[PDB]
């Protein structure tokens with residue numbers, strides 16, 4: 001099998017617990033109606049939270065592939081590691097606001 | 103037999119367990135009627151979910167053939183491996199939205 | 205899992221208990237109405253308090269990465285260390301004003 | 307005079323002709339009232355064009371100071387030069403949308 | 409001036425007459441109402457028409473910068489030129505349908 | 511300019527008159543209703559004609575780029591030229607067939 005090997009890697013670098021938790025939260029607020037409180041802020045907070053997770057997932061794929069294969073450049077890795085670390089940090093910050101406003 | 107030899111390879115690089123579930127779920131949503139909730143979003147989510155699997159399957163066929171037969175080209179494998187791994191990632195992401203909205 | 209590793213670092217350098225407390229305080233005054241006493245000063249004090257934590261978190265990310273990898277430069281580290289310590293100092297002052305005015 | 311020397315350089319890397327036009331455009335839409343058509347989209351489009359203009363100006367300050375002063379590093383300049391050009395590109399793109407929706 | 413040097417270069421890789429035209433058509437159909445004939449297909453055709461040009465513009469910035477500065481890497485340029493030339497081709501095809509459906 | 515050169519190159523290798531005529535014929539047939547005689551055959555014929563035209567354009571872009579840049583390979587060029595010629599043969603036959611049923 002070859003697809004199963006890819007699925008494990010692609011599922012290794014994504015928080016399925018947090019990603020799936022936000023999935024129903026977007027659904028629950030959507031069925032609650034635009035007139036409901038914090039509808040406008042919760043939609044954008046969740047949307048960019050999931051959006052940041054996708055970009056995080058893509059970045060983690062690049063770093064993992066580039067780590068062992070490439071050994072010459074290290075300055076590119078340092079920038080990518082910082083961007084991956086910082087982007088994860090903003091997901092932690094957003095999740096608190098979702099929890100606080102939820 | 104020579105066809106069974108090809109059929110094993112053509113089945114090894116496909117998640118037939120996952121592909122069949124999306125196939126049956128697509129059947130259910132169509133028979134539930136357009137008036138059913140999330141009809142417009144579920145069809146496109148499943149459609150490109152199935153589409154991404156076929157594209158991944160085609161990519162896996164090329165990578166497997168090019169692995170052992172050719173060794174000089176190395177960036178082409180790295181681009182294809184990164185494209186295959188990332189394409190698998192969005193199937194994982196889309197599957198999450200399928201379960202959440204289903 | 206790699207996102208767990210990134211979540212470990214991104215959460216170690218954040219005052220989660222205080223960040224959550226300020227976020228909930230901000231929601232309470234917001235629902236309390238602009239006519240509430242000390243509305244204007246409470247919002248700006250909390251707002252820049254949360255802003256300071258985000259800036260501190262990013263600075264702590266840079267310092268944590270640059271410590272072990274970089275050894276040629278130390279004057280840059282000294283400036284970055286002082287900015288983080290002083291920025292943390294102004295945070296402590298704010299919650300004193302927040303607690304006093306709340 | 308020294309503030310004259312700084313003032314000229316500060317204006318050498320800013321398009322005051324374009325900057326001032328948006329400022330009056332933001333004033334016009336702000337006084338026109340939220341009830342005006344395309345109020346929400348105009349405010350965000352104009353504001354982030356102004357914000358992008360400031361960020362470009364700060365980037366140009368760094369490049370000018372670093373260009374003649376520094377000769378060893380070259381990768382940093384190319385990354386800064388590119389981000390300067392692409393950031394200008396979005397201002398051109400955004401300005402077209404303000405003109406179209408004006 | 410230094411902003412004009414970037415702005416003139418960033419404008420040399422855009423067809424502003426072509427970009428501005430599509431922006432007006434998008435405004436025209438939008439004010440015309442969702443009930444209008446071919447409202448749905450016109451919105452999505454124009455939306456990806458504009459979106460494609462931004463992607464080409466970003467690629468054109470990279471291509472121009474990389475051409476003179478770097479000379480060792482050659483296969484990267486051919487992929488970038490192929491992506492730019494093909495993406496321009498799809499813009500021509502899309503513009504045909506918008507004219508046809510308008 | 512740079513987008514102008516790309517648009518000229520991409521427009522050289524597309525028969526815009528035939529594409530535009532096919533698009534108008536498809537639009538007219540679609541407006542004429544499903545009850546129209548030869549509806550489904552006309553729809554599928556025009557759709558596959560447009561698809562063949564797009565594929566021909568992509569192949570021509572690839573051949574035009576690969577001609578001067580690469581000289582070591584000739585058999586691939588011969589295969590691509592044969593495929594392009596055969597595809598234009600089929601699309602010409604298709605337009606003849608639509609003209610017959612028009």
Ligand SMILES: CC(C)CCC[C@@H](C)[C@H]1CC[C@H]2[C@@H]3CC=C4C[C@@H](O)CC[C@]4(C)[C@H]3CC[C@]12C
Nearest residue numbers: 052078079080081082083084086087090262266
């Ligand atoms: C609104 C936000 C969430 C979206 C856009 C923010 C992103 C693109 C920006 C905001 C702050 C930025 C970081 C700020 C500081 C550093 C440290 C430096 O040594 C390398 C670049 C790096 C790592 C930047 C990478 C890009 C970054 C993460």
Ligand SMILES: CC(C)CCC[C@@H](C)[C@H]1CC[C@H]2[C@@H]3CC=C4C[C@@H](O)CC[C@]4(C)[C@H]3CC[C@]12C
Nearest residue numbers: 058062154180181182183184185186188189192
């Ligand atoms: C909406 C989506 C599913 C359609 C478009 C997806 C495809 C065409 C795009 C989206 C993101 C892209 C990837 C983004 C980043 C990289 C890393 C780079 O080193 C090689 C190319 C590679 C691997 C790209 C390959 C093509 C890619 C997978």
Ligand SMILES: CC(C)CCC[C@@H](C)[C@H]1CC[C@H]2[C@@H]3CC=C4C[C@@H](O)CC[C@]4(C)[C@H]3CC[C@]12C
Nearest residue numbers: 252256282283284285286287288289290291294
């Ligand atoms: C009023 C506050 C909240 C906003 C501005 C704060 C920041 C930008 C300023 C205010 C005081 C400043 C510090 C004042 C004194 C020192 C010691 C000196 O040897 C190095 C710079 C350093 C470490 C400064 C760093 C930047 C600093 C922290």
Ligand SMILES: CC(C)CCC[C@@H](C)[C@H]1CC[C@H]2[C@@H]3CC=C4C[C@@H](O)CC[C@]4(C)[C@H]3CC[C@]12C
Nearest residue numbers: 358384385386387388389390392393396466470
């Ligand atoms: C929505 C917009 C306005 C905000 C985000 C834009 C910024 C943060 C991003 C988006 C596209 C990015 C650029 C995309 C491509 C390149 C070329 C590469 O060789 C160096 C990085 C560079 C130059 C990136 C710099 C940062 C960049 C400009």
Ligand SMILES: CC(C)CCC[C@@H](C)[C@H]1CC[C@H]2[C@@H]3CC=C4C[C@@H](O)CC[C@]4(C)[C@H]3CC[C@]12C
Nearest residue numbers: 456460486487489490491492494495498568572
């Ligand atoms: C529906 C469309 C607009 C979205 C996806 C289109 C883009 C991402 C895809 C579709 C066809 C692709 C091209 C197909 C063939 C080639 C030739 C090869 O030697 C290099 C890659 C290149 C140049 C591909 C680049 C990416 C490409 C242009």
Ligand SMILES: CC(C)CCC[C@@H](C)[C@H]1CC[C@H]2[C@@H]3CC=C4C[C@@H](O)CC[C@]4(C)[C@H]3CC[C@]12C
Nearest residue numbers: 558562588589590591592593594596597600601
């Ligand atoms: C429904 C139809 C139009 C789609 C299938 C057509 C394509 C995929 C097929 C049909 C006929 C085929 C061609 C038939 C004969 C030749 C000559 C041979 O020396 C090289 C391959 C080449 C050039 C084939 C290329 C692919 C081809 C053009």
